[PDB]
Amino acid sequence: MNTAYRVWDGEQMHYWDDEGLSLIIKSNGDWTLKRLYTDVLVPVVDSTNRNAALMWGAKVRGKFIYDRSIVKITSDDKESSDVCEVKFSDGVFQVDVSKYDVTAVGWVEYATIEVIGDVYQNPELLEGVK
Amino acid sequence: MNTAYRVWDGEQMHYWDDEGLSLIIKSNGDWTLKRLYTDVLVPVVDSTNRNAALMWGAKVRGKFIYDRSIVKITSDDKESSDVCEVKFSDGVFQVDVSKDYDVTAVGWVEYATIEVIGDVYQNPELLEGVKLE
């Protein structure tokens, strides 16, 4: 299933499976997240809102990643670890693996990847390790 | 705009930009291709019809690529060509490069060129008999 997605209305994160939500992509490329209250579909957020965001999910490692921040710790020891933002570009969910430089998140060979957040809800996480 | 998609409804292919088409993703993960006639939303296909299929697109090398067939031809000598199907699996639009890599990201093909010539739905049996010389 290639339906997993999540929208950020600006205040909170929205996951595709949330009850009532339904995503609607329009002929002009616009998108609109809709919720079902009673028998009425209600506009939660919408693409014309430049603060909002739509992130797709990739099934990989039996899980779904989207546009998160993750901790890539080498399977070896502590030989490598990092916090790199998962990006979707060039037709592939990639991550900085300078611990190549970029590679599919589902192709991380000698490492274990763990989602710890997302650029929206953890804007600060991309810094100061120890 | 993370939005490009196309749906095969069993008989014909539908692209996101076609007038009045609206793709609807439901909470249970189902999808439905709708189409606005006058100002009435009219269904075209569902995820229920197991014949139909939802294919996403990715922008790579300026062009948008969905889940079609392409002919990878070496940027070098024609001592490397192949008609290969683009599958979207594991978070990457991979394509067979077997003819030091078996498969790779279509946007990461290094030494050759890619040219879409059709898709698995409207051009089945397009992956054989291949001339050479």
Swiss-Prot record, chain A:
Q: Which Pfam families match?
A: YopX (PF09643)
The entry describes its oligomerization and partners as: Homodimer.
Protein name, UniProt field: SPbeta prophage-derived uncharacterized protein YopX
Swiss-Prot record, chain B:
Identify the Gene3D superfamilies for this entry: 2.10.70.50, 2.30.30.100
Q: Which SUPFAM superfamilies match?
A: YopX-like
Superkingdom of the organism of origin: Bacteria
Pfam families per record = YopX
InterPro entries per UniProt: YopX_protein
Give the transmembrane region(s).
none
Q: How does it assemble?
A: Homodimer.
Tell me what this protein is called: SPbeta prophage-derived uncharacterized protein YopX
Q: Which organism is it from?
A: Bacillus subtilis (strain 168)
Q: Which gene encodes it?
A: yopX
